[PDB]
Design a protein around this ligand. Structure first.
Ligand SMILES: Nc1nc2c(c(=O)[nH]1)N[C@@H](/C(S)=C(/S)[C@H](O)COP(=O)(O)OP(=O)(O)OC[C@H]1O[C@@H](n3cnc4c(=O)[nH]c(N)nc43)[C@H](O)[C@@H]1O)C=N2
Ligand SMILES: Nc1nc2c(c(=O)[nH]1)N[C@H]1C(S)=C(S)[C@@H](COP(=O)(O)OP(=O)(O)OC[C@H]3O[C@@H](n4cnc5c(=O)[nH]c(N)nc54)[C@H](O)[C@@H]3O)O[C@H]1N2
Ligand code: SF4
Ligand code: SF4
Ligand code: SF4
Ligand code: SF4
Ligand code: F3S
Ligand code: F3S
Ligand code: F3S
Ligand code: F3S
Ligand SMILES: [Mo+6]
Lengths: 207, 509, 207, 414, 509
């Protein structure tokens, strides 16, 4: 609008949604955990944690994720990073089968316990997808889900603004975004590890 | 005095990004065969950690390297000749497949062939490449500890934490991690060569590359224990051992090794080092292990010294090799700038793949800190990686040479910042570490800009010397099976003749 | 072992497709007979993700696809046919292939930058530009760099050397990540704010 | 200390302080505050626009350098204008019915100084309103087959554009977004290629499986209706949402991905080592190619050849069903076009009678596009006449490209 | 009806410059070994001449090719199965080394080592590569007749001068010469395959390349006589025969042959031809040899014909091969424009390397001549090379197809001159030869501009089909000597296993 780097956003919606000027805004509450936590207990402790999905080292998104070289240099399949404190609290040991879930869905994977992960957050590196080394879910009774099985789209009104100079449409130039880091999930160690494939090669994680 | 040459390698751990590209390219080219699928000639490890194979640095457990007896004589830690032969029916120290990891694959085809009406979404489960059986779970891999993967108490079993109060490092604010890529060291006093009963392992005279003769190896599997770096891997299928071959097929024509040219972080340097082979035993048997580093530097010879040059020519070193030695980035980093250090010199093998230690973020403190000798940039004393850990890894526990390397790197940074930001000449930091402006500028040229021609200065191995390159050029590669390759005597039971040789002798002299 | 070698079709769909073609010489009408039948339509949709893929041929899949497209465009509208393909920069013509076919017939071409949440709405807001940034070589011209929520060695691997090398020119670097990420290994200082609260730190710094 | 050092450095070097930022900050709901925070730091220190300084945002490979050369090819702008672009977040939020489970309200995001009564409704209501005001694109666009509008307009004795505007005001024709579950306003055919939507980028994976695919899903919570929540005021509501919307899912890949596993048809495509193409990035200034080291293995074909063949079959199969048609296409007000100067002082909703429905200003542009369906293949395989008749351009500028077309006739033959 | 494919080759003799570059590159790559030093898989001959080996076209002398018996059945000219076996102890028709030339080298080292005080300037004299003895004089070579080297009466013994009053050509003003580069024809009905008692020679199903199995060949040396083009050369050292391999290692991935890509004159074209294998015998056994050319064209199938395409797919022809066949320059020149003709179709082998005849300077006349049908450009009747000579070489003596090819080339020239010089459209010449403007423009595109992508349209041989490319990709090339290659049965006396195979079977199906 001004032809210069715009610090002030004067569009009606920008003003009314409180962003005419930059201001601090805390992570939003997706309310995806409190309605399902403890509803389908498997006997193990459950805990809510921030679910971050930074991009992985053993693939570019899901490409190369099934590549044996990447699977061999990584942890052989879908895994989730947990702080030592959180894992110990939940009785989870390194490489234990765990299940992460909320109102949106559930996923299964193995834990990577590490000191470099701060307490309160979990990281399932972006995309390890749904075709390799995933057992059945104790929550859904279906094949375990993926990292996006626990997320859901929530648009922001300020990203719908159009017909206003710099705030006008363009393919890939403006529009609602698929934000996802504010998500929280319930985490717990798995008990029954059923593969749902008729091989009769299932396991049970004790206690 | 017997001069020999070798293309040494230096890895700048300060620029290491722990990406493993080096490992994947080597694997694709050299070890994708059944039998060595679990073997990574080049492998990268995140420290603190126990590595691949697990706890390979624990020589009390694995018995690798050499020991210096009370009489001053060298003996493989594995035992002398008789002791070693007495262990041949079952090597008691041999690492098992589980010390590496059980190689696996996945049933991808189940995704394609799953029958109609499946009760659940089909999936690809793991299967062992050793037994072909279903694996209930993958519990180990060659890079299992990547980026501090595992509880600190487990990772901290790291041999290099010896003599260090490591409790403080289990605290979040004091967390640290580094990358250690490694391959065979192609040692001057290799423990592998010394521990092979068949004498199938040898160091090539012309370029110092150490190889396991695939014809002559008998599969005694003692060498695996002998190597303190555990860089020899048994091929469980062929029944013979294999190891990094320093990409000799490429080096032979002057090309960088695959892991060197494909190093994304641009941290690997290749350059010739001329050494006095006659001094190898004297150096490796020095009484104090903290003297091994300097004793080895003393075996390296000055390539610009006419005395060395003339001796080199007399000893058969090609002119192009001597020339390459005179512009060797490895010689500059190890001998001139003292930035590169050997990996575990205490094993007494006189390793030829060296490392520049890594810098790190400043340690946790009470406040934001104050300007130090280097201004806004770090002072060596503030780095978070404990210098004693690095000394255990590179200098037999002596922190002096590690501190010098790190301080010099930081000094170069201070000097360059004054130059590029303040537009002023400030040699205060350089003077403190004994560096001249010229040295700092050359260090910068090689370490920062690092042009391709400066990272790799590999001369030809001159395959034409003492051989017959003409008939070879004309007939090599026609692998019809003449059955005459590999022997000097011409007689052969199948009454054949070499395809790449001349049988009709000239009668005109 | 995971390479796709031949065109594949869900068995239930193939069975109905071939039976339909036996009663309808025109493929558009064959498709209609299947899709307009709730039981038939449901039979192959519920088979999605449940095995049964069988080898088909380019001729068979091309006819079915063309027929389905015509039927949909004719009875509901061209915008009831859509295609999702992203990041044309990685393979320009490959992206163009489907986008061109769809655009000619009136199908919808779905965006990706916003969808993936790679679009920083703050860019159009501040500069009226989707995204335009300095090349990695330009990092080398900087004398002070803060890597904020960007895992350079892991997610910008081929360009990381510019970051590690510029340090030798006297450039100071700072890593800002909640966990001890790979990027921290390369910097002079590691700041670890609670994830999601970075704007607070930026505001205080601006202050 | 760092704020000071950062600024001091920028002052001494005239802006050579830089901030490399990524998804660690950009994937939060309030990504804009994270970014404007960093951006202000850089602007206050005069770092933007100076070599060695500025905002260095790195995420995906979004920079296709030869932009205006590629755009006409990709969206057939050499033959017809405009195409049908759509912003996917709104598209999936709508069609995979994730709005039916929304927990976040616009009300709780408003400034405390805003008139709450002026911003009531579900988040999707704001999108529908944005759509009808020409702010955002729609897809499907209208609640009636856009190929039939011109016919009805002719019988009404008025041109298609005026007929559409009149129908919209009166409500005889409605934006499809108002009734996404009526059975005619959802996508039915979806092509997926160079993407693993169902195994990677698809947020709300279980919702996509349920509503788009019609298969079992792992959704654990109840939807708005089941919770007795407030239904939207711009969108119709039904307790039992429409499931299995996609009639055909076609995926092209070289490996059997998660998306392939859930598709109806999988087409084997050529790997990057088996086809010719080009690649560029934000990171460096070089353009280089993908090349075929060997012909695609087995029965794989490049994406280009796959769609060319589909275009060929479509062109023959459509005969008798689709001919030379007239299409009514909505187009949102575009940034970098004179129309971006739409609403200067406030927001007026024509449907609320706050202003007239003026396409291209208070509503989306209403364009007429002629399509020659039988000629799809011939057009696909040739550079259209619009490059010569109209020209080429982008980012608010245009130019004559006749000499380039002349060159192309010699390079590609005719 | 059984469809098969092959990459045929067309050489445009009109653009031939007789440089031999094709011969040198082939030699360097494939035949520089002792035993085949005298063998030129690709060799170029100047005509008129007798060639290499001498008088190879004289089948009455060399007994090559096939004959059609009175009962209509085909039989190698060498004799039927029993007749041939009766000649095995000493092939009575075998060409001797002198029919080629005695391979030689020179004593270059004498130039370097000549002793001080030599009475005369040292020189390098010839020595035999067969005996190693001094040669008093070199009297023959593989290209001895280059550029009319030799008396006319000697060169004119050329078989192709049959039925021609050649006296007039011994006159200076009537002198003419042309170049004939040639390699193996990789025939559809190869006489070599039919005359090998061990069955070691075969035509590859997927690409029609004809090879001599170096494992299975027993050195019966009968095939050499069988080949009417004398393109099989005995390796006097290995005791086995070798021949042009159509550079299959390159063709297999879609690359041109070495002699094709290195052809300086840009006269070689490579393109797929689809043929009905079931019609081979019927075509080759046609009664009149002047019908063999057309009978072969009839065996070639239209690649754009959906009937052929569907049959091809049913018969296993890869889609990329069918696609390549649809843009084959060889198909256009042989089938559409009728410019390319087979080499000696009367041998009845159905050769797959064809030639476009050469134009030549106008013949000697009384005056400077007048404008003809083509203006200042030549009319076919005025060319100096006797058309009957070309017909004896390419069409079994029938001048009709040769005249058509030559006239069409001249017509294209007339049409293009009107266009580029007069700026006018003149199709008079094209109409006279039955060509359309479109055909002339395409001919021009391929023959004149001849872009690389238009000269070579070689598809992949698809080595992944019906084989296991994955384990091969991972382990091919490690020639340690597993002794398990070359056999389908796994059992082997040395108790070994294939390096590039998987021995541990999957137990999960
Ligand atoms: N919670 C959460 N959600 C998030 C993100 C997050 O951080 N957190 N990240 C976003 C972001 S930033 C991105 S960039 C998307 O995931 C990228 O997804 P996409 O499916 O396109 O890549 P991918 O690599 O997975 O897909 C590539 C597919 O295409 C195949 N492929 C690759 N090349 C080709 C080609 O040339 N032709 C064809 N036909 N296919 C090809 C490939 O095998 C794979 O299946 C997304 N959602
Ligand atoms: N190896 C690899 N590289 C890739 C990709 C891949 O999938 N794999 N994908 C590419 C694409 S498309 C994208 S979008 C990028 C994404 O890559 P980046 O932009 O690097 O994105 P992230 O991985 O999400 O975040 C980077 C790091 O920031 C830290 N972080 C997480 N949350 C926060 C936070 O709230 N505040 C701060 N300050 N830091 C935080 C973490 O250490 C995390 O690893 O990578 C690109 N390159
Ligand atoms: S590092 Fe290499 S040369 Fe040294 S002992 Fe081990 S295998 Fe032998
Ligand atoms: S030098 Fe060659 S063989 Fe050795 S680790 Fe590197 S790539 Fe592998
Ligand atoms: S030309 Fe070749 S294929 Fe034909 S007969 Fe001679 S050697 Fe055999
Ligand atoms: S095709 Fe190959 S082997 Fe045959 S003549 Fe040509 S270069 Fe020699
Ligand atoms: S001990 Fe020697 S015999 Fe082979 S297995 Fe090792 S090189
Ligand atoms: S880990 Fe990466 S930085 Fe080089 S040493 Fe290996 S390629
Ligand atoms: S006859 Fe046969 S046995 Fe060998 S020498 Fe000729 S291929
Ligand atoms: S003679 Fe020369 S013109 Fe070509 S065919 Fe051989 S390279
Ligand atoms: Mo992205």
């Amino acid at each position: 609008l001004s032809g210069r780097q715009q610090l002030y956003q004067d569009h009606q919606w920008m003003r009314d949604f409180g962003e005419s000027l930059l201001v601090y805004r805390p992570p939003i509450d997706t309310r995806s955990v409190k309605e399902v936590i403890g509803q389908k207990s498997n006997g193990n402790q459950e805990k809510a944690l921030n679910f971050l999905t930074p991009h992985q080292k053993w693939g570019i998104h899901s490409t190369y994720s099934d590549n044996l070289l990447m699977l061999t240099l990584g942890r052989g399949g879908p895994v989730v990073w947990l702080s030592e404190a959180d894992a110990k609290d939940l009785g989870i040991a390194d490489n234990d089968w765990i299940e992460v879930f909320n109102s949106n869905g559930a996923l299964t994977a193995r834990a990577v316990v590490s000191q470099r992960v701060p307490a309160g957050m979990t990281m399932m590196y972006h995309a390890q997808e749904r075709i390799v080394n995933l057992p059945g879910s104790e929550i859904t009774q279906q094949r375990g889900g993926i990292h996006n099985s626990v997320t859901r789209i929530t648009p922001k009104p300020t990203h719908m603004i159009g017909g206003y100079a710099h705030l006008a449409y363009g393919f890939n130039y403006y529009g609602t975004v698929g934000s996802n880091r504010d998500e929280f999930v319930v985490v717990r160690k798995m008990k029954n590890i059923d593969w749902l494939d008729g091989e009769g090669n299932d396991q049970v994680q004790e206690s | 005095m017997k001069i020999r040459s070798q293309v040494g390698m230096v890895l700048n751990l300060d620029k290491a990004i722990g990406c493993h590209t080096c490992s994947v390219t080597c694997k694709n080219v050299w070890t994708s065969r059944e039998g060595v699928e679990y073997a990574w000639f080049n492998n990268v490890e995140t420290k603190p950690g126990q590595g691949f194979p697990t706890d390979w640095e624990n020589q009390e457990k694995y018995k690798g390297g050499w020991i210096r007896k009370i009489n001053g004589k060298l003996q493989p830690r594995m035992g002398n000749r008789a002791m070693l032969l007495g262990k041949i029916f079952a090597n008691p120290h041999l690492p098992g497949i589980d010390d590496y990891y059980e190689p696996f694959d996945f049933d991808y085809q189940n995704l394609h062939t799953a029958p109609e009406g499946s009760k659940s979404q089909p999936i690809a489960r793991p299967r062992s490449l050793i037994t072909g059986e279903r694996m209930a779970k993958i519990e180990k891999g060659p890079n299992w500890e990547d980026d501090l993967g595992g509880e600190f108490d487990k990772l901290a079993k790291d041999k290099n934490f010896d003599n260090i109060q490591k409790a403080m490092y289990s605290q979040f604010e004091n967390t640290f991690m580094m990358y250690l890529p490694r391959l065979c060291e192609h040692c001057l006093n290799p423990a592998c060569v010394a521990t092979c009963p068949s004498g199938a392992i040898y160091k090539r005279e012309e370029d110092g590359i150490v190889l396991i003769d695939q014809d002559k190896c008998r599969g005694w599997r003692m060498c695996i224990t002998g190597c303190p770096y555990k860089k020899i891997y048994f091929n469980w299928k062929s029944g013979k051992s294999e190891k990094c071959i320093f990409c000799y097929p490429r080096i032979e024509a002057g090309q960088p090794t695959v892991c060197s040219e494909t190093c994304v972080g641009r941290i690997r340097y290749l350059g010739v080092l001329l050494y006095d082979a006659d001094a190898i035993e004297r150096a490796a048997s020095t009484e104090n292990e903290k003297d091994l580093y300097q004793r080895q530097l003393d075996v390296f010879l000055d390539p610009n010294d006419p005395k060395v040059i003339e001796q080199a020519i007399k000893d058969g070193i090609p002119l192009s090799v001597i020339e390459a030695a005179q512009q060797s980035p490895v010689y500059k980093m190890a001998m001139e700038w003292k930035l590169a250090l050997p990996l575990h010199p205490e094993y007494r093998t006189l390793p030829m793949v060296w490392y520049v230690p890594p810098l790190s973020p400043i340690q946790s403190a009470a406040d934001a800190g104050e300007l130090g000798s280097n201004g806004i940039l770090p002072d060596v004393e503030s780095l978070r990686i404990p210098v004693q850990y690095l000394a255990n890894l590179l200098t037999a526990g002596d922190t002096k040479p590690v501190l010098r390397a790190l301080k010099r790197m930081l000094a170069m940074r201070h000097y360059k910042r004054a130059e590029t930001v303040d537009g002023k000449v400030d040699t205060r930091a350089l003077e403190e570490v004994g560096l001249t402006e010229a040295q700092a500028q050359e260090m910068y040229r090689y370490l920062a800009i690092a042009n391709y021609e400066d990272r790799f200065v590999v001369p030809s191995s001159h395959r034409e010397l003492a051989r017959e390159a003409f008939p070879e050029k004309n007939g090599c590669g026609f692998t019809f099976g003449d059955g005459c390759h590999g022997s000097d005597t011409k007689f052969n039971l199948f009454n054949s003749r070499r395809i790449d040789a001349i049988d009709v002798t000239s009668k005109t002299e | 072992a995971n390479r796709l070698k031949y065109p594949m079709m869900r068995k239930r769909l193939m069975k109905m497709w071939r039976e339909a073609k036996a009663l309808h010489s025109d493929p558009v009408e064959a498709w209609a007979s299947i899709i307009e039948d709730a039981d038939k339509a449901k039979s192959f949709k519920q088979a999605r993700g449940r095995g049964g893929f069988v080898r088909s041929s380019w001729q068979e899949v091309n006819e079915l696809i063309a027929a389905s497209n015509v039927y949909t465009i004719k009875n509901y509208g061209p915008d009831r046919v859509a295609g999702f393909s992203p990041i044309p920069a990685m393979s320009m013509v490959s992206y163009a292939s489907g986008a061109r076919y769809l655009s000619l017939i009136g199908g919808t071409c779905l965006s990706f930058y916003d969808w993936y949440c790679d679009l920083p709405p703050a860019s159009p807001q501040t500069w009226g530009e989707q995204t335009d940034v300095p090349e990695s070589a330009d990092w080398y011209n900087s004398s002070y760099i803060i890597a904020w929520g960007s895992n350079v060695p892991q997610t910008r691997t081929p360009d990381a050397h510019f970051f590690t090398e510029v340090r030798y020119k006297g450039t100071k670097t700072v890593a800002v990540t909640p966990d001890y990420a790979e990027i921290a290994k390369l910097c002079d200082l590691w700041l670890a704010p609670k994830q999601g609260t970075d704007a607070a730190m930026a505001l205080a710094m601006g202050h | 200390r760092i704020a000071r050092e950062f600024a001091d450095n920028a002052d001494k070097t005239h802006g050579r302080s830089m901030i490399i930022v990524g998804a660690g900050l950009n994937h939060w709901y309030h990504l804009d505050m994270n970014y404007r925070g960093l951006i202000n730091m850089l602007i206050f220190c005069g770092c933007v626009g100076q070599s060695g300084g500025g905002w260095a945002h790195y995420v995906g490979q979004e920079k296709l350098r030869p932009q205006t050369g590629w755009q006409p090819l990709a969206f057939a702008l050499d033959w017809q204008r405009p195409a049908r672009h759509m912003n996917s977040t709104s598209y999936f939020y709508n069609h995979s019915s994730q709005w039916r489970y929304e927990t976040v309200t616009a009300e709780e995001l408003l400034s405390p100084m805003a008139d709450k009564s002026r911003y009531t409704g579900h988040l999707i209501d704001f999108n529908v309103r944005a759509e009808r005001m020409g702010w955002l694109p729609s897809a499907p666009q209208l609640g009636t087959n856009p190929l039939t509008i011109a016919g009805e307009a002719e019988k009404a004795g008025m041109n298609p554009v005026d007929y559409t505007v009149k129908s919209l005001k009166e409500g005889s024709i409605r934006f499809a977004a108002e009734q996404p579950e009526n059975g005619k306003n959802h996508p039915r055919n979806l092509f997926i290629w160079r993407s693993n939507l169902l195994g990677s980028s698809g947020k709300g994976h279980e919702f996509m499986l349920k509503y788009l695919l019609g298969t079992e899903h792992g959704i654990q919570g109840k939807d708005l209706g089941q919770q007795g929540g407030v239904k939207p005021e711009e969108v119709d509501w039904q307790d039992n949402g429409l499931e299995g919307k996609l009639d055909l899912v076609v995926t092209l890949d070289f490996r059997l991905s998660s998306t392939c596993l859930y598709s109806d048809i999988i087409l084997p495509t050529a790997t990057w080592y088996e086809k010719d193409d080009m690649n560029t990035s934000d990171m460096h200034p070089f353009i280089h190619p993908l090349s075929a080291a060997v012909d695609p293995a087995w029965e794989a074909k490049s994406d280009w050849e796959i769609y060319k063949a589909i275009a060929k079959k479509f062109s023959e199969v459509c005969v008798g069903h689709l001919g030379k048609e007239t299409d009514i296409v909505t187009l949102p007000i575009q940034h970098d076009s004179a129309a971006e100067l739409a609403q200067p002082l406030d927001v007026k909703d024509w449907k609320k009678g706050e202003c007239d429905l003026i396409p291209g200003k208070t509503a989306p542009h209403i364009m007429v596009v002629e399509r020659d369906y039988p000629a799809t293949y011939e057009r696909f395989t040739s550079i259209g006449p619009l490059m010569e008749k109209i020209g080429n351009g982008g980012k608010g500028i245009a130019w004559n490209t006749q000499s380039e077309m002349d060159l192309l006739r010699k390079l590609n033959y005719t």
